[PDB]
Design a protein around this ligand. Structure first.
Ligand code: GDP
Ligand code: GDP
Lengths: 96, 53, 420, 420
């Protein structure tokens, strides 16, 4: 609810020309979201990254972000790199 | 003290600020590591003066 | 350089007696000043070194119409403090006049210690505001010290007195003390009798013997405010180096206090910081905001946790500076001492420049303004009238403190760049 | 945001005392307020976090001329609830007037907690309707809260009183409370003394000590209604999301209660869901129909059973409803706690908007209408007459509650699209 919440205020409010895509704001909100979750702070929380793929020219009317390409990226260790394939985490992104 | 001191101070104040904003900007490009910029303006004083490009 | 503490007045002599006793047990010192057999600290600043390890602190004890000072002498620690330097009204004017006749012998006692030390960096006064004898004598001695040591700096552990408002002239005495304190004191650390009395009611049931128990509360703050100097560290290893951050403009030199475990009798750094910003841990009683905050922690603190703790505090925003400058919460860390209990393994204190303290100054100025119109207590005692026939130092004090009251609120405004 | 519970009145103070005690054992808490050593749940909303893990509930306890009130203070849990915020007739008017003189100090106690919390989302009142002191004081405090704190959402755990009909003015007091409740409550959860007394007679032989035993029944419902908030979940984590589905139109904000285990002291979901739709498990005493239904089940439920279960209750149609609102029953699931017993590990509760509760409102309106004509108990006590000489708030209340009685039956009709 929180990672989505901060972003939503900004996305709807303005900064619509990818001013919400400042790498700094993105990282700031992510760390803020992870810290404020309260489920916990763990070695597991590491490898969490906030990122983007397709670059928006500007956000549209209703600020839909109907396909906003904000990709959460998860690093994987060498042994489990074999267990978790890049295509596999490619699917995980879709539900997000 | 009212004028001559101020005249020396303003040029140094501008030069220090110029040497300070260029530094924080050239440190902001990099990607603990970012705890450097976050701590320097813990209040939000000079939160942003000139957005680069 | 070594620090010389000019503890004066019965109330001031009570908190210096205890502060030195607190550093007796905390440091490796016995009641006879002998190095303890059971015993890594920088004892050079606070304690003079005798050849037989007699750690006699450089305390200057001034007794005017002595009564409490007779009791300080009948103590097991009488030998511990032996620089052999103690020298023999409830009105500010009554105290100031008594000090003027004995000024040269009390001032030679200051000289002796200054000559004896390798060096002297600051004069720390256990001052009592509206302290009867303590105020007036303390203001006068405050004025002489700066002229003689223009390069040197003076701090004041002012126990600003708030007892819910006995002294009928208390506002007049306090009014005069601040005028001297605003122009003739490099730093001041403010404490409040009511604020501590409220904390005493909170942490304990003690109400009637408020002065005896609160002495311990003033002491814990006092020992703590110096622990970064008394124990070596990477940073804040000089008084002056520490003083600069806490006082950004000369006029606003009054500092608020707080202790994370008021009930000190594990905890992560993220926790001890948040607890402190809360107002129950504070010991002091239009938008308002801090000018710059600092904190020192002494216990089992993880080093990497502190830089994460600073980030968490920034997000919590429990307090926001919003000043004209880059003032930031400053994290500092120290070692808790061995020998004495390690309870509350992590335990902290904060010293901060806050515009709220202006309100406490205005309340005594309010009592005084009301009292001035009535002229109910002009004293008109011949000492009071003969010393002050014009009674215009009170008005000079009123404009100077009003300038201070004004300056503070100007600090709150967006333009302290312009004159305040 | 953290929830602040304004428990008020002797009856209301009794069910808040128990509700907090129920979450003491259920959560990892101790009578001192510190966490137990043996102790993954969200304690942030209901419990304030002290520095040394003293999780103190944010309870606001209001008392009036206290005598049996002191009994809460002489308890092992006196330390557990220490926000140190407790401040000192059987008529609704008598309670409302007493509240007005002390409104600012009780309101500052509300402020303190609001300032202390990171945030405040809602005010949950353990209200007693026709509660002597509890009603009147509770209506007045209900009116002040919305004006000051419009952003927050209020709930009322109203223990609507039905004892087979001692208070001779009981209908008059209740009549006035509802006009305020309808007007100044964002939500209300209704309970009935007779409905629970009938349950007590059913599950147990207890008849004469109905109030002491029924306290446990009200508690099990109260702890249960917030268990989704108290424990982590993928949905409805916020109080607001939960509230929206249960109340579809603002006027109809009264919620019926039920527990699948009338006696909780394996079972498939298809079974636990069916029990909520039997009237023996309901705890409340022209076509009639529910407006929307919701259920929360507890424990390691088998999930596949629910698809079968949800489609299963549908064929059973045990719950008959066709309101203006769509009204699909909503299925929620939560974790039974890891401290309390696993006997009857699966146990459910249901909260629903039902037009039958209109009948309970009309019965007190019937007693009042009969009583109003007789004017048998106008009190005419000078407090009652001087506070209300016109006696027209009772008539203002009568039209507002009649609008409510009318609105409900309009809900039953096919056209609530038109004004109700
Ligand atoms: N903090 C603290 N203040 C004290 C104590 N005893 C007296 N005072 C303060 O001292 C002030 C009066 O000074 P007083 O004792 O009359 O000095 P005297 O003229 O030497 O007796 C009052 O404002 C008190 O608040 C104490 O034990 N602790
Ligand atoms: N559920 C429940 N209701 C109670 C209990 N004790 C009293 N009541 C209710 O409280 C109402 C009367 O409030 P009262 O006790 O007179 O409040 P007082 O004026 O503070 O004494 C009645 O309608 C009772 O149904 C109890 O233990 N449990």
């Amino acid at each position: 609810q929180s990672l989505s919440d901060l972003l939503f205020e900004k996305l709807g409010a303005g900064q619509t020309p990818g001013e919400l895509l400042n790498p700094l704001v993105l990282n700031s909100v992510l760390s803020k979201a992870l810290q404020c979750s309260l489920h916990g702070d763990t070695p597991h929380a590491s490898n969490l990254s906030l990122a983007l793929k397709y670059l928006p020219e500007v956000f549209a009317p209703n600020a839909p972000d109907v396909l906003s390409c904000l990709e959460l990226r998860y690093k994987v260790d060498w042994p489990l790199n074999i267990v978790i394939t890049e295509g596999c985490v490619s699917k995980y992104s879709g539900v997000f | 003290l009212v004028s001559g001191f101020e005249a020396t101070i303003n040029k140094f104040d501008k030069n220090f600020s110029a040497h300070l904003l260029d530094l924080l900007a050239r440190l902001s490009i990099y990607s603990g590591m970012a705890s450097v910029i976050s701590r320097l303006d813990f209040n939000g004083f000079y939160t942003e003066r000139l957005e680069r490009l | 350089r070594e620090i010389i503490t000019l503890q004066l007045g019965q109330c001031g002599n009570q908190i210096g007696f205890e502060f030195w006793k607190q550093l007796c047990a905390e440091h490796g010192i016995s009641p006879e000043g002998i190095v303890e057999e059971f015993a890594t600290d920088r004892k050079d600043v606070f304690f003079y070194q005798a050849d037989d390890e007699h750690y006699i602190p450089r305390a200057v004890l001034l007794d005017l119409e002595p009564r409490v000072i007779h009791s300080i002498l009948n103590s097991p620690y009488a030998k511990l403090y032996n620089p052999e330097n103690i020298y023999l009204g409830n009105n500010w004017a009554s105290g100031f006049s008594q000090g003027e006749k004995i000024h040269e012998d009390i001032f030679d006692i200051i000289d002796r210690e200054a000559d004896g030390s390798d060096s002297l960096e600051g004069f720390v006064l256990c001052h009592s505001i509206a302290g009867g004898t303590g105020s007036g004598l303390g203001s006068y001695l405050l004025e002489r010290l700066n002229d003689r040591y223009p390069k040197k700096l003076v701090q004041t552990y002012s126990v600003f007195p708030n007892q819910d408002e006995d002294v009928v002239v208390q506002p007049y005495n306090s009014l005069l003390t601040l005028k001297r304190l605003t122009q003739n004191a490099d730093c001041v650390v403010v404490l409040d009798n009511t604020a501590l009395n409220r904390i005493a009611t909170d942490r304990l049931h003690i109400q009637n013997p408020s002065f005896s128990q609160i002495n311990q509360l003033v002491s814990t703050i006092m020992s703590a405010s110096t622990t970064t100097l008394r124990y070596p560290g990477y940073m804040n290893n000089d008084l002056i180096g520490l003083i600069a951050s806490l006082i950004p403009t000369p006029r606003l030199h009054f500092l608020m206090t707080g202790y994370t475990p008021l009930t000190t009798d594990k905890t992560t750094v993220l926790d001890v910081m948040r607890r402190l910003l809360q107002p129950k841990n504070v010991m002091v009683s239009t938008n308002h905001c801090y000018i710059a905050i600092l904190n020192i922690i002494q216990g089992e603190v993880d080093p990497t946790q502190v830089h994460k703790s600073l980030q968490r505090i920034r997000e919590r925003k429990l307090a926001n500076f919003i000043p004209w400058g880059p003032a930031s919460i400053q994290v500092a860390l120290s070692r808790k001492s061995p020998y004495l209990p390690s309870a509350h393994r992590v335990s902290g204190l904060m010293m901060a420049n806050h515009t709220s303290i202006s309100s406490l100054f205005e309340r005594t100025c309010r009592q005084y303004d009301k009292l001035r119109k009535r002229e109910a207590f002009l004293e008109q005692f011949r000492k009071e009238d003969m010393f002050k026939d014009n009674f215009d130092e009170m008005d000079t004090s009123r404009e100077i403190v009003q300038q201070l009251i004004d300056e503070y609120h100007a600090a709150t405004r967006p333009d302290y760049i312009s004159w305040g």
